């Protein structure tokens, strides 16, 4: 395949690793990304538990909500980390990490 990742609107901020690998952006997760991942997963688990008490399925609903929240939070954290490396986001941390 022929793949070209070039945004129509260029990054206003300094760019590092214009095509970041999955492993590195997973390893670039900051404390804010982990916090938002955790809060999304917790909200999803709480909603799954609370909703599934009338039908009686209290645990399976928890597991389903946990899966949904894990996927959503991981997608959000990955998107934020990528946009930081791609330069679309403020990314003031790893721009300093790049220099050293």
């Amino acid at each position: 395949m022929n793949t070209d990742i070039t945004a129509l609107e260029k990054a206003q901020y300094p760019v590092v690793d214009r095509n970041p690998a999955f492993t590195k952006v997973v390893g670039n997760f900051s404390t804010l990304d982990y916090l938002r991942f955790s809060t999304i997963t917790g909200i999803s688990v709480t909603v799954g538990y609370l909703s599934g008490i009338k039908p009686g399925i209290k645990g399976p609903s928890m597991v389903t909500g946990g899966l949904i929240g894990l996927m959503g939070g991981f997608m959000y954290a990955y998107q934020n980390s990528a946009g930081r490396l791609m330069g679309f986001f403020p990314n003031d941390g790893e721009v300093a990490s790049y220099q050293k």
Binding site: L35, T39, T41, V45, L50, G59
Partner: peptide, 30 residues
């Protein structure tokens, strides 16, 4: 009268606490 004995509801409570803490940290750290 010392343990909740409901190992399923306990996970929901700790998950809710984690969600509240994460929301607070999101509001402050960002």
């Amino acid at each position: 009268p010392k343990v909740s004995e409901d190992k399923n509801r306990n996970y929901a409570v700790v998950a809710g606490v984690v969600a509240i803490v994460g929301s607070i940290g999101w509001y402050l750290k960002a």
